[PDB]
From a paper:
Proteins containing a FIC domain catalyze AMPylation and other post-translational modifications (PTMs). Among these, Bartonella effector proteins (Beps) comprise a particularly diverse ensemble of FIC domains that subvert various host cellular functions. The FIC fold comprises eight conserved α-helices and encompasses a characteristic active site loop between helices α4 and α5 that forms most of the catalytic center and the substrate binding pocket. Additionally, FIC domains generally contain a β-hairpin between helix α2 and helix α3 that is referred to as the “flap” and mediates docking of a target segment in extended conformation via β-strand augmentation.
Residue numbers in the entry: 0 to 209
The structure:
Amino acid sequence: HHMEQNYLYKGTTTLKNKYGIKDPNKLYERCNHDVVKEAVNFRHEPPPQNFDAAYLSLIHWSLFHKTFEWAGHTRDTSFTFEDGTTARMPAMRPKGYEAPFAIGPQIKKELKQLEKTLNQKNNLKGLSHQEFAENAADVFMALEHAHPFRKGNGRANRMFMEKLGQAAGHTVDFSFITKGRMTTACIEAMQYGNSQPMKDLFEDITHPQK
Ligand SMILES: Nc1ncnc2c1ncn2[C@@H]1O[C@H](COP(=O)(O)OP(=O)(O)NP(=O)(O)O)[C@@H](O)[C@H]1O
């Protein structure tokens, strides 16, 4: 259990962070604030040639480097903090639920499989509204199950989808999507094998580019 605990301040359930904030709720507030600002900037970046694991990590670094020392690094790789301790978390399972995220070697395997799919589908270009929304839901569910980071997966994955939409000719807009709406879609897909809420979600947030 040792490696996993090194993500957290001794005795707390709070992730080590660059603010040195020990209060979990204050960390949440400060992090969110910084991520929203960095997200505004990242929306202006030109699309990458390849939508791959490296790009997801670039997104994660861009959103979270002010918050976490390990921003951009996935939880299957050992990370050594400035404080000298080393953390890793190959297995994560949402509390109170049976189905885990990708475990250990599965994280890389799943990301590689998603890379191949996107390359084969030419990054979802040349698709109608309906076709893009359908395929984008599948991509997002794959990202969500992979859950490659210790924290910040939702925000990195959602930005990945915004940028994919930008490249593909579709605006993907999460601005009116509550935490509850998103959580319900994610849980139904991953815990219960029901993709309809996620399909509906991507239909609701996908629009022609203006
Ligand atoms: N029981 C669950 N099963 C599957 N996915 C879940 C479950 N609970 C939460 N999730 C999803 O896990 C993601 C959150 O991962 P996390 O590493 O906490 O990302 P985050 O960016 O830090 N937080 P957030 O802004 O709320 O998405 C969200 O997409 C949730 O909908």
